[PDB]
Amino acid sequence: MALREFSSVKVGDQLPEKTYPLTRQDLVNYAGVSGDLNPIHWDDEIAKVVGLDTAIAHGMLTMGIGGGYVTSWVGDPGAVTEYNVRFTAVVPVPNDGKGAELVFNGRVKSVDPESKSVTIALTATTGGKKIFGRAIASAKLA
Amino acid sequence: ALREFSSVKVGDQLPEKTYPLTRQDLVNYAGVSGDLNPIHWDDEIAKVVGLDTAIAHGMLTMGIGGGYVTSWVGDPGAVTEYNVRFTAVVPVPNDGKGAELVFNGRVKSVDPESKSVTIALTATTGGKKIFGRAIASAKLA
Amino acid sequence: LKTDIRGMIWRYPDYFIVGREQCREFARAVKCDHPAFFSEEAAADLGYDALVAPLTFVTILAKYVQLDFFRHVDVGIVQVDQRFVFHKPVLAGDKLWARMDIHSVDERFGADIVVTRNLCTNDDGELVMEAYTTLMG
């Protein structure tokens, strides 16, 4: 997997859709890996005191996943120059043996030939509801 | 600083220390260690295999013992062996309180030729031992 | 706001080593699968002499600094926005120095809005990354 050629990309191109599964175990793993041990991401009863149905994925976990998504299309993590996300929705992750699924999509929003940069606007949804507001990534292609 | 060899006598007892352990600690240890086995953070899985509640990782309690032993030695780098047999589980209820592990130790032997000491350790939770043979050695100053 | 913090610059008194094994675990933790996250050969194929860190990795450094700040200045939280600007690729083995500035302070409709800017520089003093976090009250 190598760096995508710039000359092959046009504005309006759509990225391949990718669906990622996430289970409570992923949430528990991420808590310790990241240091964010806030119990709303792993204790359902705490979720209820603040008004949620169930524990929710960390915002930075879902953003991190987006980073993996964008890097596979680009072809080089080192090529990415920006990644910006507004968090509009929570991502419930039920402890039901299946969990939740996040579906990521993207469209090329802008290109700048002088720098060989592309800017993608992304969308991510769960059960049909968007979890990001403004969500863009840029990279310098080959 | 590293404890002086000449100050240690066979039979000396280490200070007792109590460590609190909460559910948050177990979830933290799971990700830090990579051991995501749900018996350490999911009560329902624990019950399925016959336990009352999620339990601390064995290596978590051994890890605590290493800190215990290092505070007495005065230098983690001085420890030459650390061996622990696991006999019991440590329930950690998710009730806002958790569990307590009480560590104790006694000097079992000293060796002037190498300036080595060997400690026997014991660890309990609600008074019941969680380790069997549990020893650490170190080369003192 | 409780304490006026506008334009405070908070230099983190410690450096941060971007750790190889920790990166790989972070990568798998956020489901990255590009081989430049995990292999030195794959990263070499793309020109890098160490592995590339997951693009959100420096969130750990950013919050080391943020918590050090709040521990030292009283103000008395949900994160609504996150932005990363990569001026250089951040690799395993990199030594990073962190510096948080208070970019903005507001209090629109209800509670408070602070935008932190986490600056990351390396041992030569060149700028490798900036991270903007928007916190809400």
Next chain:
Amino acid sequence: LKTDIRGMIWRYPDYFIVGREQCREFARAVKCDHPAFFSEEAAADLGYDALVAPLTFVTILAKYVQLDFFRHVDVGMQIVQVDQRFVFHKPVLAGDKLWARMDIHSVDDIVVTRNLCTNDDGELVMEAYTTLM
């Protein structure tokens, strides 16, 4: 048993870096408070040029290798770890580069794996024995 694995050697195909920030986080996760776990200045007082790893840190490495091995040779018929042993021939500090080598030390079910850990110079820095049941 099932196939007899006594003395099988599993060479781990990768090296392992003892990471500074991860040691620090691991140390705090198992409630260490000696400053040589966290501060290079404190480690300097004891003679070391980097901070010292938590005495159980190499459990991470040991199970990278064990799972790699057990995932690749499933034998026997719920497995519990009943004993864990660490032998330190040299101090393990942050920044150390380590190579892992596991043999199947003994079998009775009761199997004891032995992980030999060496550095880039080939000297032995530590051994780790875990007993599974």
